[PDB]
């Protein structure tokens, strides 16, 4: 490195291309054995090597690999540098605008331009990781934040975690300040991009910043968001204010993650480090300014929703954000079940759960994928955690405000979107919820009995309701309560009517719900036998579709044998004849033989119950098999 004037015999604009690559490797290696003890920290002809980049980063005649390696030298050239950052920034600016588009859908992957582009991004993350630097972290985020899920950001996120883990609190203050000041300042840009700044970079870093003095950031900034949240409501007078629902939104989203991580001994104690909501000079004994300022979340819950707005999606997820924050402060500081209840579950008629949810999305299921598909909605994981935690921290009054709200409002007074959202918090939480199932089932099974759930026939939500319902039976055992019967009748008639599926493995599963839905759980049946006849009896020599009524009669048989054809509006002299006659349809095994397999159980029933019909049904069977004996010896 001392021979730096002789070294300047290379790096010329007129150089052999393989040697334009080869020269970089020597300085790229040297700093890895040297660790920047010369030609780096304001020492040697550092200004000359650092200005040589102004000639190189201006060339046009290149692949992305001279440039790709050049950006990989930066981790050393701006380690510890207190100046010349504007010399770097202007060539980074001229590089990024030329080589990379505003959106990645410019390219199908495997076109060479894209493989070179993603390699520049790899080389910049390789550069970021061991720069540990706020200059590069800032400059990277504004290249990422332009659309969602477009460069496989799940690889980029790993670099943020890695620098958040391995570094000092003072460097991490520099990181966190630079990305905060970027988000805080209101120089005009698209609101969607403006969300993604916190949401898809800053927030990812916060979750992984080091355990101690992470409080130093929040204690330095906390006054800003609190002073922001208390105003602007008289200025919703034009559409550009979507840039503002974004700021309040992000400002809820940079503190719930700080109620997360942080110790109980800082957030509720005799000594209030975070006493900065007030001046804190006099309020050093005890922390309660949180429960002074929960009012801010309250406004974000209970705003009487506007009559004619045009930002409703951003309104919705704003209401969600402050609700997450209300979870996060309460589940830390407000330790009573009385204040976990709090306002948090207990509203005046500007009711919470009616506000958080879009009321027009058809929100349909898929029983056949490829939970985090449509459970991917806001709040759901937080609320499973909220109830799960307090189940370890011990009553019907908590769910009374929920189950009987969605239950007694069977009417359109709540939309179906609300009822399914409430029901989802049951389904994923049965093992947390067993004690109350007796009075919860009247609401919860009424949902699956209601004439619409969005399901075209059976769908995964009814499957989850009926599975949870059955799963309660051992401890809860609801039978014979006055509504249970008339709903169970509607369940069985529906579950059986729509049982079929084009895919054999799915059809076999629907059928297996019935087997336990009777034998483990109802006397209260009124078995839908008037259907069952139509599910088999429609003659055609190449029908497979008779077979379902065979299989289904095999379920209503195998459950310790309830009787067949009592008073159901159909005649035994026709009904059983068809059920035998099916075994003429010899084209398919499951059509003909399965009818005989059922009948060999029917005789065992009627003979052992000593009823007269075996005097006739034995003759029906015998008459038909004779037709095979003379004509089809194998069948």
């Amino acid at each position: 490195l001392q021979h730096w004037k002789k070294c300047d015999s290379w790096w010329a604009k007129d150089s052999p291309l393989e040697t334009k690559m080869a020269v970089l490797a020597l300085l790229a290696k040297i700093l890895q054995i040297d660790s920047s003890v010369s030609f780096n920290t304001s020492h040697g002809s550092f200004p000359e090597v650092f200005t040589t980049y102004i000639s190189l980063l201006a060339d046009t005649k290149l692949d992305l690999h001279l440039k790709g390696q050049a950006v990989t030298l930066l981790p050393f050239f701006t380690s510890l540098t207190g100046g010349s950052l504007e010399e770097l920034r202007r060539v980074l600016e001229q590089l990024i605008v030329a080589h990379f588009p505003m959106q990645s859908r410019e390219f199908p992957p495997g076109t060479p331009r894209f493989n070179n582009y993603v390699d520049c991004m790899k080389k910049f993350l390789d550069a970021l990781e061991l720069s540990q630097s706020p200059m590069l972290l800032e400059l990277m985020t504004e290249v990422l934040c332009r659309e969602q899920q477009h460069v496989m950001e799940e690889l980029f996120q790993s670099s943020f975690r890695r620098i958040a883990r391995r570094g000092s609190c003072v460097t991490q203050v520099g990181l966190l300040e630079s990305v905060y000041e970027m988000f805080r300042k209101d120089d005009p840009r698209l609101s969607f991009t403006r969300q993604s700044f916190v949401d898809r970079s800053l927030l990812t870093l916060l979750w992984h910043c080091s355990l101690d003095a992470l409080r130093e950031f929040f204690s330095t900034i906390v006054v800003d968001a609190i002073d922001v949240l208390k105003s602007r409501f008289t200025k919703l007078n034009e559409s550009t204010f979507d840039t503002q629902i974004t700021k309040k939104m992000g400002y809820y989203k940079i503190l719930d993650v700080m109620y997360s991580r942080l110790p109980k001994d800082d957030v509720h104690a005799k000594e209030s480090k975070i006493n900065q909501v007030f001046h804190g000079s006099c309020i050093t004994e005890g922390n309660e300014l949180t429960k002074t300022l929960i009012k801010l979340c309250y406004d974000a819950f209970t705003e009487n929703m506007a009559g004619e707005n045009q930002l409703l999606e951003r309104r919705r997820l704003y209401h969600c954000a402050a609700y997450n924050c209300a979870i996060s402060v309460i589940c830390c500081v407000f330790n009573e079940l009385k204040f976990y209840q709090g306002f948090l579950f207990s509203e005046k008629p500007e009711k919470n759960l009616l506000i958080f949810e879009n009321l027009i999305d058809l929100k349909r299921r898929y029983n056949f994928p490829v939970m985090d598909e449509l459970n991917r909605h806001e709040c759901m994981a937080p609320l499973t955690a909220l109830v799960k935690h307090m189940h370890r921290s011990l009553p019907r009054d908590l769910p009374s405000w929920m189950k009987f709200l969605h239950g007694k409002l069977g009417n359109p007074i709540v939309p179906l979107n609300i009822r399914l959202f409430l029901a989802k918090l049951v389904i994923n939480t049965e093992e947390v919820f067993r004690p109350y199932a007796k009075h919860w089932l009247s609401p919860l099974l009424q949902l699956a009995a209601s004439e619409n759930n969005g399901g075209e026939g059976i769908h995964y939500m009814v499957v989850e309701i009926v599975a949870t319902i059955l799963s309660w039976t051992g401890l809860a055992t609801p039978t014979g309560v006055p509504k249970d019967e008339v709903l169970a009748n509607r369940l069985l008639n529906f579950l059986m009517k729509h049982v079929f599926h084009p895919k054999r493995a799915v059809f076999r599963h629907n059928l297996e719900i019935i087997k336990t839905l009777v034998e483990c759980w109802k006397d209260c049946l009124s078995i839908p036998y008037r259907l069952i006849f139509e599910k088999f009896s429609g003659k055609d020599p190449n029908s497979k579709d008779n077979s379902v009524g065979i299989q289904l009669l095999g379920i209503v048989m195998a459950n310790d044998l309830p009787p067949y054809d009592p008073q159901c509006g159909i005649q035994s002299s026709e009904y059983f004849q068809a059920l035998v006659n099916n075994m003429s349809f010899v084209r398919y095994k499951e059509v003909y033989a399965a009818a005989a397999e059922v009948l060999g159980l029917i005789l065992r029933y009627v003979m052992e119950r000593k009823n007269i019909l075996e005097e006739s049904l034995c003759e029906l069977v015998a008459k038909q098999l004779k037709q095979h004996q003379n004509t089809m010896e194998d069948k």
Partner: peptide, 7 residues
């Protein structure tokens, strides 16, 4: 419900 807020 302002007294489920506060204290």
């Amino acid at each position: 419900v302002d007294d489920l807020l506060d204290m």
